[PDB]
Amino acid sequence: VIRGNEVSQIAPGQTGNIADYNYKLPDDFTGCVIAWNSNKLDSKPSGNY
Amino acid sequence: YAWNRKRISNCVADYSVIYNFAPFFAFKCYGVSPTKLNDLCFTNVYADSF
Amino acid sequence: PTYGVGHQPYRVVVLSFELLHAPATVCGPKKSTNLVKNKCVNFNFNGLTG
Ligand SMILES: *[C@@H]1O[C@H](CO)[C@@H](O)[C@H](O)[C@H]1NC(C)=O
């Protein structure tokens, strides 16, 4: 689970916060990335920590 | 029709706080890429808001 | 839930196929056919045609 600003960061050839320190994909990667919004299930009014 | 232009100069620009300041999706650039903006540098930056 | 559309949580599932070098284990739904020889036929061996 990531934030909405960094969904496009899950791609071959990306740098920053998620792609450099958390989850890096190879340059010659073959496969599919499936992302969808989960604001109903993974959010709380007090703040999901 | 009366868009405001702000001149940015004589400073150090960090582009990683743009995602923190505003809740957008795509940082859509044309002559550059979003991930390489912190390495090289420019003369002047203008901001146009409407 | 009061945040903007760029700060919503997102679930990401990444499927990572590896191309065929070892004998194939996972394959899609297709009916197999009897093997014929010494004839000009179109073949399909583990997804590659000819
Ligand atoms: C914008 O500025 C106001 C006033 O300084 C502040 O209360 C608000 O939190 C700021 N917004 C963000 C996203 O930081």
Q: Name chain A's partners: 3 or more CB pairs within 8 A.
A: B, C
Entry resolution (Å): 2.9
Beta strands in chain C (DSSP E): 9-15, 44-45, 48-49
Sign of CA dihedral A41, A43, A45, A46: positive
Rg over CA atoms, chain A: 13
CB-based contact, C18 to chain A, within 8 Å: yes
Resolved by:
cryo-EM
Note whether B16 contacts A17, CB cutoff 8 Å.
yes
Cα–Cα dist A14/B47, whole Å = 26
